[PDB]
Symmetry: D2
């Protein structure tokens, strides 16, 4: 069941991309927002295509989401990031 993780990724993308634009000492949040939005997209694609690397991609996505949430924590972004990390860890297990 990947529907819930896909939704969390999509929500995280949205929040990270909005935070990126609004932010534009925020250089760290901007960098992470870009990388997080990019890895979330990759995780969505991996889950939608049934990729053999879906779990590894999800694990990476969690790590990036956690870092992005820590740095933005911007508060909406941090929340969506931590939720997405949790869902990606579950998928990765």
């Amino acid at each position: 069941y990947s529907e819930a993780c896909i939704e969390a990724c999509i929500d995280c993308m949205k929040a990270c991309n909005h935070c990126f634009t609004k932010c534009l000492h925020l250089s760290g949040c901007i960098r992470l927002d870009r990388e997080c939005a990019d890895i979330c997209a990759l995780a969505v694609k991996a889950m939608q295509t049934d990729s053999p690397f879906m779990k590894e991609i999800c694990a990476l996505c969690a790590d990036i989401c956690e870092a992005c949430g820590t740095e933005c924590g911007c508060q909406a972004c941090a929340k969506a990031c931590f939720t997405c990390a949790e869902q990606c860890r579950s998928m990765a297990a």
Copy 2:
């Protein structure tokens, strides 16, 4: 606002990616890949408020229409996405 179009793009991505894997039809496979890729780009454009959002959506609609025509579930999602993208692109 863009939530409905984003949702249609995401549904189209899902359907095109599922069709790509199941087909693996060479025309459908090629278009499935391109359509999924342009849907993802349209999602990003809407989420980042890109100045090229309308142009990207227009392109996305064209590719979705072609993908739907060739695949014609995927076809259904494609035509839905095309119409939502045309509305955004106006």
Copy 3:
């Protein structure tokens, strides 16, 4: 890559320049930063489209030219952080993409 090798190269060069500019600008530049991200991303897509003989390659190249033209215009308003180099690479890429798109 008989007909696309040059345009591919210009897109690869533009990606490099835009990504470099993005990072340097981050260390009044917010418009350049945004466009650098968009332009690097579309250039990567155009490369993929050309390499895979994708049926929308010409349309993708036309979009790439438009985004490159805009990125070049915005980066061209700044005189450090690799912005003038980025503008040049953008304009080169736009011209090559317009040829491919024909």
Copy 4:
């Protein structure tokens, strides 16, 4: 520094994309992995060029996908598959160095 790894990723993208189109004109596993590998190589390039804080982790992933793509394409003797395998294995080795 990343120039050599970038170059290997760019070469691997080229080979995977070429292999994808040639295979489409028992190759379904190669076609799938060609798509994923070309895509991750593009991401690794961006990560290196933008000095992204997860560049090392992305390079590690890119190595794993490259190794799998090479292993699968390496089972076939036309459609640019052997060339694709070689470029995949080269890339993987450069990415592993960058990921350290």
